[PDB]
Design a protein around this ligand. Structure first.
Ligand SMILES: *[C@@H]1O[C@H](CO)[C@@H](O[C@@H]2O[C@H](CO)[C@@H](O[C@@H]3O[C@H](CO[C@H]4O[C@H](CO)[C@@H](O)[C@H](O)[C@@H]4O)[C@@H](O)[C@H](O[C@H]4O[C@H](CO)[C@@H](O)[C@H](O)[C@@H]4O)[C@@H]3O)[C@H](O)[C@H]2NC(C)=O)[C@H](O)[C@H]1NC(C)=O
Ligand SMILES: *[C@@H]1O[C@H](CO)[C@@H](O[C@@H]2O[C@H](CO)[C@@H](O[C@@H]3O[C@H](CO[C@H]4O[C@H](CO)[C@@H](O)[C@H](O)[C@@H]4O)[C@@H](O)[C@H](O[C@H]4O[C@H](CO)[C@@H](O)[C@H](O)[C@@H]4O)[C@@H]3O)[C@H](O)[C@H]2NC(C)=O)[C@H](O)[C@H]1NC(C)=O
Ligand SMILES: *[C@@H]1O[C@H](CO)[C@@H](O[C@@H]2O[C@H](CO)[C@@H](O[C@@H]3O[C@H](CO[C@H]4O[C@H](CO)[C@@H](O)[C@H](O)[C@@H]4O)[C@@H](O)[C@H](O[C@H]4O[C@H](CO)[C@@H](O)[C@H](O)[C@@H]4O)[C@@H]3O)[C@H](O)[C@H]2NC(C)=O)[C@H](O)[C@H]1NC(C)=O
Ligand SMILES: *[C@H]1O[C@H](CO)[C@@H](O[C@@H]2O[C@H](CO)[C@@H](O[C@@H]3O[C@H](CO)[C@@H](O)[C@H](O[C@H]4O[C@H](CO)[C@@H](O)[C@H](O[C@@H]5O[C@H](CO)[C@@H](O)[C@H](O)[C@@H]5O)[C@@H]4O)[C@@H]3O)[C@H](O)[C@H]2NC(C)=O)[C@H](O)[C@H]1NC(C)=O
Ligand SMILES: *[C@H]1O[C@H](CO)[C@@H](O[C@@H]2O[C@H](CO)[C@@H](O[C@@H]3O[C@H](CO)[C@@H](O)[C@H](O[C@H]4O[C@H](CO)[C@@H](O)[C@H](O[C@@H]5O[C@H](CO)[C@@H](O)[C@H](O)[C@@H]5O)[C@@H]4O)[C@@H]3O)[C@H](O)[C@H]2NC(C)=O)[C@H](O)[C@H]1NC(C)=O
Ligand SMILES: *[C@H]1O[C@H](CO)[C@@H](O[C@@H]2O[C@H](CO)[C@@H](O[C@@H]3O[C@H](CO)[C@@H](O)[C@H](O[C@H]4O[C@H](CO)[C@@H](O)[C@H](O[C@@H]5O[C@H](CO)[C@@H](O)[C@H](O)[C@@H]5O)[C@@H]4O)[C@@H]3O)[C@H](O)[C@H]2NC(C)=O)[C@H](O)[C@H]1NC(C)=O
Ligand SMILES: CC(=O)N[C@@H]1[C@@H](O)[C@H](O[C@@H]2O[C@H](CO)[C@H](O)[C@H](O[C@]3(C(=O)O)C[C@H](O)[C@@H](NC(C)=O)[C@H]([C@H](O)[C@H](O)CO)O3)[C@H]2O)[C@@H](COS(=O)(=O)O)O[C@H]1O
Ligand SMILES: CC(=O)N[C@@H]1[C@@H](O)[C@H](O[C@@H]2O[C@H](CO)[C@H](O)[C@H](O[C@]3(C(=O)O)C[C@H](O)[C@@H](NC(C)=O)[C@H]([C@H](O)[C@H](O)CO)O3)[C@H]2O)[C@@H](COS(=O)(=O)O)O[C@H]1O
Ligand SMILES: CC(=O)N[C@@H]1[C@@H](O)[C@H](O[C@@H]2O[C@H](CO)[C@H](O)[C@H](O[C@]3(C(=O)O)C[C@H](O)[C@@H](NC(C)=O)[C@H]([C@H](O)[C@H](O)CO)O3)[C@H]2O)[C@@H](COS(=O)(=O)O)O[C@H]1O
Ligand SMILES: *[C@@H]1O[C@H](CO)[C@@H](O)[C@H](O)[C@H]1NC(C)=O
Ligand SMILES: *[C@@H]1O[C@H](CO)[C@@H](O)[C@H](O)[C@H]1NC(C)=O
Ligand SMILES: *[C@@H]1O[C@H](CO)[C@@H](O)[C@H](O)[C@H]1NC(C)=O
Lengths: 175, 319, 319, 175, 319, 175
């Protein structure tokens, strides 16, 4: 993917996540846990659902047409009847092939973008109180129990509150 | 500890599946869907559209009234089904531009006939043959009327028939091609016949060609068949001094959604909105690889038999 | 304070607008444009292309010289306009493959005629009818020349006419279909006519069919019309012993950009580069939903009547 | 959008920005103000302007063709004349539908990318002297009057100059 | 120092190249490739497909057996090449629906003939002309058989010939159009001829038209040519009392991949899988702008003569 | 590009890099040097190689067809023969034009994404021990000889080891 999140800095997917498509795992003072993120999941699904309907219109009735299988050899007219049909099929075949490749390419980058967006959104909340570990995991430099974690998951985490604690814990060192 | 770690991820499944993109020839995603309807139902569903099984009859033969096709008089249809084993069983004939007449009637969607009172003074009507035996008796196409001489007279026929109905009438008529000069005189006093069917707009005369053809149902004679469309307020005028195979009336042309289709598949009590010679098939997909020949609400025919559209992210398992 | 805050953003408008993407069925953008020309001008612009109004005349009738179409002799065109109310007003006729001859002349883009000195010894020329009265006098198509017998003689005609001009000549000729055997002898001494128009390449003979047709302008007779293309250095040779409706010369075929179109819309003093039966329409867009029938520099006809192309970012208002 | 800038970390658009498409607002020692960014605006416009011309070539003259409306019922030939035309229209209709969806999808991600690029470009200038607030706003840890702000807006801001001041102001705390 | 700097980058080349995207009309990339085959080889490669040079002969003339085309008997082909300078050199003729017969034989891919023992009692065979001199002697098409009267007798011919072979036979036959009524009696005792070639399915009669045509190889007479397809188990029956130009046997129709093509380019000892009238061209690209007329494994014809596909990143040099 | 890496925060390309498509330059205690990155290079090539084959299937044999150049004027049938052919060519011409623009657009964003991914990947390794300079260059706040540099280039750099040294060097200042 262009964002290098899925199959990238996030080394792999979670088979044990049936809640949703994207989400969090965490370890803290109260143990370990897991939670799906609804918005990102839903964002991805709404784009993928009925994706093809945005290009191919609801398929239409067609009745009498031209003959396409011939008993006898006629020459000129039949040559043209066949060529017309042959030309149409090939043009539609090209179309379907291309449409599949586009959509699928679009579906991938879309989903990689939703992963990256959720990571970036999360980071911006944590501010100076966390460290990007490279896994797609955050080292949070303060005590952050389940209510603290939920607050991050629901966009209500206030970094000012924890800044002082995090600074102690971060700068506990320096040769 | 005195810290906490918060990890971000996405999901994965055990049963991943391969699809193509612009970047990769093959790549595993969490889920995908067939866009190409490959499987047919194996039978033509009787229901959604009005289907008519021609059985032993062709569309053309049913409308001319080949006796063994009497059952199909009165019938209309959305789709007429023509079977391979169908056979003609009446006077041997041809139709210049057969294919077009078949196309025209197929669209009309009916072979319902409306008789008209033509007056043929001088001649004798309802000529029959051993070619179509209605029962064990000699007969002829029910929709046509073979005129031969009476006494020793075949007077220059001249009949007129106006259209006031407010739609097009389709008249089916013909000319007889006898086998010998001895026959051409015997049946029609003149030594060469002629048929001039005319309107104001159009006009078409046919001279009967003469001679031996191969035997078919004990007959070396033939009949050639033509049609004439007669617009509202116009008029049909038939002039002939020999060999006329006269019309008994008109068909009504409709601007219909009807068609004909060649197939040997059986009809059955299911439901479907799209029909191929291979049987009914399903609507739900955008493309289909069953048959270029279709009727009704059908997916688009393409060459390829599978196309997978991804409906999920890339599947990235661990092991 | 003792710090500073620096915010980054983008713009928004009060009058946002919806468009489709691959990700959303509907999404509001700052601005967008119609790609589908839905509106017609209501009139056919007189200017950019050379337009010719057929009025009461069809293209075919103007070129045969139906008296009431004399005005159209001398005329060329880019687009010939055929009106519904047009009518024929001369000898009743037909043209095998009418549609093709019409197509051929429409492309030529002119009905300008070049007379030629044919010599018809033995017969009398300029036969006329009550079917086309030029004024109150009997007349005939101006571009054709009806030959009948003189004395009691209609000698086997045999006329030759070479093409040296260095382009194709298009010759228009015909055969007469009399109503009775009494008429066929009366006008042309023989009991059956024949016309054999020939070149080196091609050759086509026509036997005149005979009998009563419906009355049209007090006439049950008819005339059938054919054409012959005569390549440079080749030659036209007309052989006949009855019924010939002779040519008076040739039309010049051009490899033109000209056409014909059926429409009832009026012509007017505006300007446009694209024409439909609904009137002129505008070039500026790539597609158009006015009519599949078009001439000139035209957008592409599609089924849909609106398609919005976004020309700005997503509009994200506050409230 | 895939970059999650427009309709994302930038909560909404500015109706009162008629200067350009992207830009800055700021508060500082001299009050508040606003300025459009020309490059990013122009980048976006040049891509959108004449976008369709890159695929559909300047539309061409066509003259005599085939008949498409018929007075009489002819059968075989007319069936084919109609099918040919019918086939052409449907193929073009598909094309237009697809073209619109692509371009529009492209136009969105393009404009989201220009927003994100300008934010990222700005951040890289500020270096250690600012904090990403999540709004798409920067907390700058020093006194930065209008000339200081312009310098950021024109790519000429020198973080070394302010580093010391910013460090005092940043690390004024720590439990 | 006591630190270190680590820079990230990408590459660039001296010879950059412009390509179009959706975002830019022109943009320089590191590398790109032509997708449009603009250049032709200048000659038609002799090898991959079986090519046959018609030289002075048309396909039709080679199969009728115009003496100067005797070399082409026995020959089959994948692609028959017709040259401009080709000429007919035998009895002057025409073929109603010439184009179709040419198409049919081109697909068959051969003009190999299989003689059959027709019995023509009453008449004399192998009529010849000054129109095709095989050597310095009078002759006629080798595949046809001109029947004229014997003594003062031309009896109503009636010949039958069954197909048991299990494939379609294609029979080529014709009718003679004499120049004068004096000639029509002289050669065939009757005053009007007739030819009725028939099967069970089809049937077609042709009356010979009569009169003067232009001279071509010292002859004002003509010959018209027709064909009949005879399905397995059906039968050919030829009935005539004048003017028959009889068949000597049948061609075998094949469901072949063969064609014909018009070109003046020379054939040569190279190799290629795709052929245009301009010469062989190369397969490697997806599109091509050489010619809409092609045969074999050919790229797709488009209007544009160049299309560059980028095969590298944007080239961003320094200076 | 949407990532604003190529022609963006990386001011230009390296003509003297024939090893690969992406890579590193560096200055350190042992001098200066240069090294290509294989993965990113290979990622880019595998997408570009056989790119067109994913849409246009291996080109197919076609034999007898319809005539397309005419000696004589016939009218109706020939009008249709020409229109059929004319319609087919125009539809394919559109297709080729569009296909080129898509692919090329895709090829650009692809390659910009590979650049950005490699920069971001590198940054995440360095953690708190480096500074993003804006060039696409990193100021590393410790002594990092060639073996230290290789370790970054091969994903094996351990920031904990150098943290203390980097902190001294970073915070040597503060007004
Ligand atoms: C032009 O040339 C052809 C030459 O073939 C002639 O046409 C043939 O004419 C003969 C004679 O009439 C036809 O033979 C007839 O066949 C009938 C049916 O045959 C088929 O089916 C029966 C079984 O039911 C088989 O016996 C046979 O093999 C066929 O498969 C027979 O019923 C007829 O026989 C009866 O009549 C004859 C009189 O001829 C009596 O002697 C007997 O009592 C018997 O009951 C008859 O033999 C042949 O079928 C025709 N062929 C074709 C292709 O049509 C034309 O007549 C000729 N024209 C001329 C000379 O002007
Ligand atoms: C084959 O069969 C048809 C049968 O219809 C015959 O054709 C008809 O022939 C009759 C007799 O000629 C035609 O009748 C004629 O109609 C003329 C014009 O009529 C139309 O317009 C007038 C008003 O202007 C109306 O009166 C009429 O209703 C029509 O709408 C009349 O002008 C003629 O009348 C004059 O001549 C007659 C002589 O018959 C005199 O008695 C009178 O003095 C009068 O002035 C005339 O009646 C009829 O129109 C024809 N029909 C068609 C469809 O063409 C063929 O003749 C016949 N062929 C044969 C027997 O060989
Ligand atoms: C219907 O109308 C046309 C009128 O054109 C007649 O057809 C023409 O008939 C004449 C007379 O036969 C033809 O003339 C003949 O031309 C022959 C060949 O000519 C071409 O080539 C030679 C050189 O090889 C040139 O001389 C000439 O210019 C041509 O380019 C000549 O060889 C003939 O001459 C020989 O025969 C005549 C007898 O007529 C003798 O006097 C001489 O001794 C000489 O050896 C001859 O003159 C002319 O070509 C025909 N034209 C066309 C277009 O076919 C029809 O005959 C006529 N039908 C009727 C009246 O029923
Ligand atoms: C991944 O693989 C495939 C491909 O994506 C996927 O299967 C397909 O997914 C589609 C779309 O989600 C499903 O569509 C369904 O098709 C059914 C026809 O067979 C149809 O019955 C369904 O209609 C119902 O859908 C909604 C739920 O979304 C119902 O609520 C509703 O029923 C009603 O709701 C009201 C509520 O007020 C009730 O009061 C009434 O009772 C009413 O009936 C609809 O009727 C639906 O459209 C298919 O399941 C499937 N399509 C095909 C072609 O196979 C898999 O699901 C995916 N697999 C995984 C593991 O993710
Ligand atoms: C969003 O909605 C729509 C859709 O994007 C948009 O309207 C369209 O925008 C296009 C493109 O910007 C405009 O094109 C114009 O079309 C005019 C024809 O009606 C035409 O006159 C214009 O040509 C002139 O354009 C330039 C300016 O770009 C002029 O300078 C130039 O004139 C000349 O310049 C020289 C300078 O040396 C002078 O010396 C001469 O006098 C010379 O004439 C051009 O002539 C232009 O091409 C349209 O306005 C419009 N198109 C349609 C189909 O509606 C809205 O603008 C957008 N709205 C908002 C709010 O953003
Ligand atoms: C950029 O510009 C163009 C466009 O991208 C590019 O040139 C094209 O690049 C393609 C694809 O890389 C090349 O394809 C080659 O075409 C040759 C036909 O002319 C063909 O010989 C090549 O096939 C061989 O390729 C592989 C290497 O990839 C060989 O190893 C192999 O040969 C064999 O290998 C086995 C090993 O076990 C040996 O034992 C055997 O001997 C065996 O033969 C293949 O045979 C290849 O497909 C073309 O060079 C070219 N295409 C065209 C149409 O021009 C430039 O390269 C680019 N330029 C730059 C500077 O980057
Ligand atoms: C020769 C012999 O030994 N005995 C003869 C019988 O041949 C003759 O049978 C009839 O033969 C003629 C051909 O000469 C016909 O084939 C006829 O059959 C029909 C038919 O069924 O098609 C009979 C119909 O009644 C005719 N219908 C008409 C005129 O409307 C029909 C028609 O003429 C032809 O189809 C036209 O092509 O022919 C055989 O029955 C037998 C009967 O006498 S008769 O010749 O019919 O007057 O007479 C024996 O002596
Ligand atoms: C029957 C009666 O009471 N009195 C007759 C009139 O009928 C007769 O009128 C003519 O009738 C004939 C048909 O028999 C024609 O319709 C003719 O009209 C024209 C016409 O206008 O088309 C007259 C033209 O002069 C003819 N032009 C020619 C030969 O070039 C033209 C042509 O023959 C036909 O169209 C061919 O189909 O016919 C009516 O005028 C009346 C006149 O005498 S005559 O019969 O014309 O010699 O004579 C009364 O006694
Ligand atoms: C008039 C004069 O001064 N002397 C005459 C010669 O004209 C005459 O020559 C023949 O003229 C006739 C036309 O009347 C033919 O053109 C004929 O040529 C052939 C030909 O080559 O095509 C000769 C063939 O043998 C004929 N083949 C047949 C019957 O199978 C062929 C055929 O009839 C026509 O092509 C049919 O359209 O005609 C010229 O040789 C000369 C010869 O006598 S004869 O007239 O042939 O019996 O007699 C002089 O007195
Ligand atoms: C995997 O299994 C589930 C549950 O049985 C099923 O719904 C899903 O469609 C499967 N995935 C596929 C076919 O890709
Ligand atoms: C909004 O209004 C402005 C100014 O009147 C106009 O130029 C613009 O095109 C409008 N937006 C639309 C129609 O989307
Ligand atoms: C640039 O030059 C090299 C080496 O000669 C060549 O392989 C490459 O294809 C050239 N680039 C182009 C034609 O864009």
């Amino acid at each position: 993917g262009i964002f290098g999140a899925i199959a990238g800095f996030i080394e792999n997917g979670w088979e044990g996540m049936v809640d949703g498509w994207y989400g969090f795992r965490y370890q803290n003072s109260e143990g370990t846990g897991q939670a799906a993120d609804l918005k990102s999941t839903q964002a991805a699904i709404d784009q993928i659902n009925g994706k093809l309907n945005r290009v191919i219109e609801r398929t239409n009735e067609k009745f009498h047409q031209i003959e396409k299988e011939f008993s006898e050899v006629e020459g000129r007219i039949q040559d043209l009847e066949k060529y017309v049909e042959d030309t149409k099929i090939d043009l539609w075949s090209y179309n379907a092939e291309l449409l599949v490749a586009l959509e699928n390419q679009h579906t991938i980058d879309l989903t990689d973008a939703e992963m990256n967006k959720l990571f970036e959104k999360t980071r911006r909340q944590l501010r100076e109180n966390a460290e990007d570990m490279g896994d797609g995991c955050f080292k949070i430099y303060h005590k952050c129990d389940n209510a603290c974690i939920e607050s991050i998951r629901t966009g209500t985490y206030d970094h000012y509150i924890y800044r002082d604690e995090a600074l102690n814990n971060r700068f506990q060192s320096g040769r | 500890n005195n810290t906490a770690t918060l990890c971000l991820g996405h999901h994965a499944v055990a049963n991943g599946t391969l699809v193509k993109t612009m970047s990769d020839d093959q790549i595993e995603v969490t889920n995908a869907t067939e866009l190409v309807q490959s499987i047919s139902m194996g039978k033509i569903c009787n229901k959604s559209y009005r289907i008519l099984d021609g059985r032993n009859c062709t569309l053309i033969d049913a409308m001319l009234g080949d006796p063994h096709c009497d059952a199909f008089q009165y019938e209309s249809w959305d789709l007429f089904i023509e079977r391979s084993n169908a056979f003609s069983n009446c006077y041997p004939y041809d139709i210049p531009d057969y294919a077009s007449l078949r196309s025209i009637v197929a669209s009309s969607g009916t072979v319902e006939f409306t008789a008209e009172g033509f007056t043929w003074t001088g001649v004798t009507q309802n000529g029959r043959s051993g070619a179509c035996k209605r029962g064990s008796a000699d007969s002829f196409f029910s929709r046509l009327n073979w005129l031969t001489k009476s006494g020793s007279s075949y007077p220059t026929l001249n009949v007129t028939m106006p259209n006031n109905k407010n739609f097009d009438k389709l008249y089916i008529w013909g000319i007889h091609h006898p086998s010998s000069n001895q026959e051409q005189t015997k049946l029609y006093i003149q030594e060469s016949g002629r048929v001039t069917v005319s309107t104001k707009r159009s006009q078409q005369t046919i001279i009967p060609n003469i001679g031996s053809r191969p035997l078919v149902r004990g007959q070396s004679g033939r009949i050639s068949i033509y049609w004439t469309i007669v617009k509202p307020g116009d008029i049909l005028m038939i002039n002939s001094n020999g060999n006329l195979v006269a019309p008994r009336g008109y068909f009504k042309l409709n601007t219909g959604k009807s068609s004909v289709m060649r197939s040997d598949v059986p009809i059955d009590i299911c439901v479907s909105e799209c029909i191929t010679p291979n049987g009914s098939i399903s609507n739900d997909k955008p493309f289909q690889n069953v048959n270029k020949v279709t009727y009704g609400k059908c997916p688009k025919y393409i060459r390829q038999n599978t196309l997978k559209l991804a409906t999920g992210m890339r599947n990235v398992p661990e092991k």
